[PDB]
Amino acid sequence: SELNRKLVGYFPEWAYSSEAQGYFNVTDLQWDSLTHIQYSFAMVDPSTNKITLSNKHAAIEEDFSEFDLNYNGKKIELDPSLPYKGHFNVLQTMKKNYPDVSLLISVGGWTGTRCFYTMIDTDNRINTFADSCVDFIRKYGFDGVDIDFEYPSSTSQSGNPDDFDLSEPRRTKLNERYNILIKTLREKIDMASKEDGKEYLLTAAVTASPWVLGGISDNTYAKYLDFLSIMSYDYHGGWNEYVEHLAGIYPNKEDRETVTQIMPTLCMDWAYRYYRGVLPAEKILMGIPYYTRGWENVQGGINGLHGSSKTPASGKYNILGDDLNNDGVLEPAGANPLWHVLNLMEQDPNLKVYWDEISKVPYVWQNDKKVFVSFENEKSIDARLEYIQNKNLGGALIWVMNGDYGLNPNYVEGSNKINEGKYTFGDTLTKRLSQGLKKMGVCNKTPDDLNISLEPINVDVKFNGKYDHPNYTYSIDITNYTDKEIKGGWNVSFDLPKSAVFKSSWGGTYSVTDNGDFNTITLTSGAWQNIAPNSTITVQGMIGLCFSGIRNVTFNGMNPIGN
């Protein structure tokens, strides 16, 4: 079961009452194609440290009397035997006909991370929170918990600026405390599974940003997850001038934001390599956007791409923009669901779709208004399927399900109203993903690190280091726990993810050997670097860029089992 491909979709609690979101509700979910639904979003309560609803009315009270609950052709009624209404009732009602679709509550997000910062301050608060998650999934019929903490990183000024008053004083400890949080959640959830005779899940949505990851020093938490969802989107957008892809798959040496770095990092494939340090591919999901970002008055570039703009796209090119002060005046971002961009192209023959064969995503360009908007289409879905099969990925997650497209029942020829275009939300790309994931078959089981099959030696190898972008300075402590001195000229090897490049060893000599998603680094010491019994020697060096961890550590051709 665990090697099955996964297609994980985020459900937006806020969409059902919003014009720009298409009034999307639970009966509009792509139930025939998704394997998991992540409900977005719950939060942490500031005073009790327990899981809490964001829009309680939407989640458990709304009766949908003014909305249309219909699946296929049949009217869907709320189950009157449940003690709650809202989205949660509709989810449980649909689950009866889709018993193998897993439902998870997602805690966090960009605007729901704030009270994680105070909850992680003490072990008792973490225990309270974790217990409250168990209580919540039992109460509301969820199959698991997804943690979307944005972000448990020491990187200053990362995450929502509204929360700097809580995140900035805590930067040095966030990663350690997050690791404790995830481990505690796993322990409590596993106990609840045994008690209930049910297999509850724990997942996390995680950063793909090298900037954020530079402030993450311990990725052990990943081993406690059923799967790790890489947020391989928001790579580019209106926060800066670089007119570039939202969600590229492959490294692009023409991405102007990274053109001088040792490799292009703002693409799924770099994050894949990063996380291979701690997980097999079959536990990693690719993040796919069904939304856009974009710019207007683009200067230079070719069809806008690789150009510059200080003005994110506005107006009809930004229907999902934030209403910061409730004027109806939206903050420019070029942010749209995919169906709205399709409708804009129906109305404007000079808004045209292009394909980038390097990054393997499409984009839309209006050559007269100089408007560039990212895009996603059948061709990029197909490229993403190829990548998923080629890399043995566990599947994909989608942010967010109301951005996929289908034909609009409320289409009005010639209308410019948001919900009267040819297209509205639908399942076109999600069904295409589901079909491709079925066709490629289950994941392969990635073999264990080879070091476990080698003869053991009682040597302990501890790899530590410090990151000062773009340089990782490593320090490896080697402790001899045998009863005989280890002569100089010993060697240690480790597998370094291809998100990073080994630069130099500060002592002795080294070699680098290609090894799949890693380079095997072999450090051969000098004859004078003897390790006495019960003694420790330290060697250092430099690596370019960052990596989730190292694997497959050997010492003198043996497995260093420590003491």
Ligand X SMILES: N[C@@H]1[C@@H](O)[C@H](O[C@@H]2O[C@H](CO)[C@@H](O[C@@H]3O[C@H](CO)[C@@H](O[C@@H]4O[C@H](CO)[C@@H](O[C@@H]5O[C@H](CO)[C@@H](O[C@@H]6O[C@H](CO)[C@@H](O)[C@H](O)[C@H]6N)[C@H](O)[C@H]5N)[C@H](O)[C@H]4N)[C@H](O)[C@H]3N)[C@H](O)[C@H]2N)[C@@H](CO)O[C@H]1O
Among residues 47 and 260, whose Cβ is nearest to ligand X? Answer: 260
**Least separation, in Å, of the C-beta of 208 and ligand X?**
8
Instruction: Answer with the entry of ligand X, Cl ion, none that 109 interacts with (C-beta below 5 to 8 A by kind).
Output: ligand X
Residue closer to ligand X (CB basis): 14 or 411: 14
Smaller CB separation from ligand X, 154 or 479:
154
Return residues touching Cl ion (CB under 5 A): 158
Rounded CA Rg of the chain: 25
Shortest Cβ 180–ligand X spacing (Å): 25
Figure out which of the listed residues 45, 199, 257, 420 binds ligand X, where binding follows CB under 6 A: 257
Measured distance CA(118)–CA(120) in Å, rounded: 6
Task: Report d(CA 213, CA 233) in Å as an integer.
Answer: 15
Q: Which is nearer to ligand X, 77 or 322 (CB)?
A: 322
For ligand X, which is the closer residue by CB, 221 or 242?
Answer: 242
Q: Locate all alpha helices (DSSP H) within 122-220, ordered by sequence.
A: 123-140, 164-167, 174-196, 210-213
Q: List, in order, residues 6 or more apart from 468 with CB less than 8 Å away.
A: none
CB closer to ligand X, 244 vs 404: 244
**In the set 45, 61, 98, 110, which binds ligand X (CB under 6 A)?**
110
User: What SS3 class is residue 204?
Assistant: strand
Measuring CA to CA, which residue among 205, 212, 203, 204 is closest to residue 265? Answer: 212
- Kindly tell me which of 189 and 335 has the beta carbon lying closer to ligand X: 335
Contacted entry of ligand X, Cl ion, none for residue 239, CB cut-off 5 to 8 Å set by kind = ligand X
- Structure tokens given for 136: 């919540």
The residue within the footprint of ligand X, chosen from 77, 196, 322, 346 (CB under 6 A), is 322
Choices 15-23, 83-91, 106-114, 442-450; region in contact with ligand X by CB under 6 A: 106-114
Q: Which of residues 231-250 bind ligand X (CB under 6 A)?
A: 234, 239
Our finding on whether 402 is near ligand X (CB under 6 A) is no
For the CB of residue 152, give the shortest distance to ligand X in the complex, in Å.
15
Query: What is the smallest separation between the CB atom of 322 and ligand X, expressed in angstroms?
Result: 4
CB 359 within 8 A of CB 264: no
Distance in Å, CB of 109 to Cl ion, minimum: 12
Closest distance of CB 41 from ligand X, Å: 9
Give the residue closest to ligand X by C-beta. Answer: 110
Q: Return the number of the residue (159 or 304) whose C-beta is nearest ligand X.
A: 159
Q: With the CA atoms of 397, 402, 403 and 406 taken in that order, what torsion angle do they form, in degrees rounded to the nearest 10?
A: 120
Considering the complex, what minimum distance in angstroms separates the CB of residue 498 from Cl ion? Answer: 24
Shortest distance in whole angstroms from residue 111 CB to ligand X? 6
Give helix 174-196 / helix 123-140 axis angle, nearest 10°: 40
Minimum CB distance to ligand X smaller for 42 or for 492:
42
| Helices of type H across 197-330 | 210-213, 268-275
The interface partner of residue 211, options being ligand X, Cl ion, none and the CB cut-off 5 to 8 Å by kind, is ligand X
Please, which residues bridge with residue 477 across strands?
462, 538
Dmax of the chain from CA atoms? 86
Q: How far apart are CA 217 and CA 231, in angstroms?
A: 19
3-state SS of 400-460 is CHHHCCEECCCCCCCCCCCCCCCEECCCHHHHHHHHHHHHHCCCCCCCCCHHHHCCEECEE
**DSSP line for 382-401:** HHHHHHHHHHT--EEEEE-G
C-beta of 331: minimal distance to ligand X in Å?
7
Q: Contact positions toward ligand X, by CB under 6 A? A: 109-111, 209, 211, 234, 239, 257, 322
